[PDB]
Amino acid sequence: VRMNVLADALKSINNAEKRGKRQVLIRPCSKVIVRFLTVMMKHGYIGEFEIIDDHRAGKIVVNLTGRLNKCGVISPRFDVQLKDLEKWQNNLLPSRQFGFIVLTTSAGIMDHEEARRKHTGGKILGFFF
């Protein structure tokens, strides 16, 4: 059955962008999906997106750009202490320049650089390069 809607959203985005599409429709929406897409958006990876409100779990239409190579979820949400970030990025990001581990921390949804800056850890959600 349909568990981990963030996984399905990221798989849909990756599959649509590898086929060279301009927009992608993902359902169902979630607040974790919206914060993940905002984290991508502030780094200039997925353009800008819009939430469609039906009285169910909504849908999202995302305007793809082309700078993304792969976005992915890390399931299950492993506990990531503030040291483990270097280990985790050396397992996940193919280089030191571009790529992002997204963490759900007590300060909210962020990427690993802003996780280091606020001096906190959390649970790992995904990565995009």
Partner: peptide, 30 residues
């Protein structure tokens, strides 16, 4: 046709060349 290990080396090298390609394109933007 040709060995798998040589194909894997070629795929790794072209992906690495794409990695510095994206890095140089990002560096030119500043």
């Amino acid at each position: 046709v040709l060995p798998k290990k040589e194909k894997m080396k070629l795929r790794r090298e072209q992906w690495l060349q794409k990695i510095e390609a994206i890095k140089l394109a990002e560096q030119k933007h500043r």
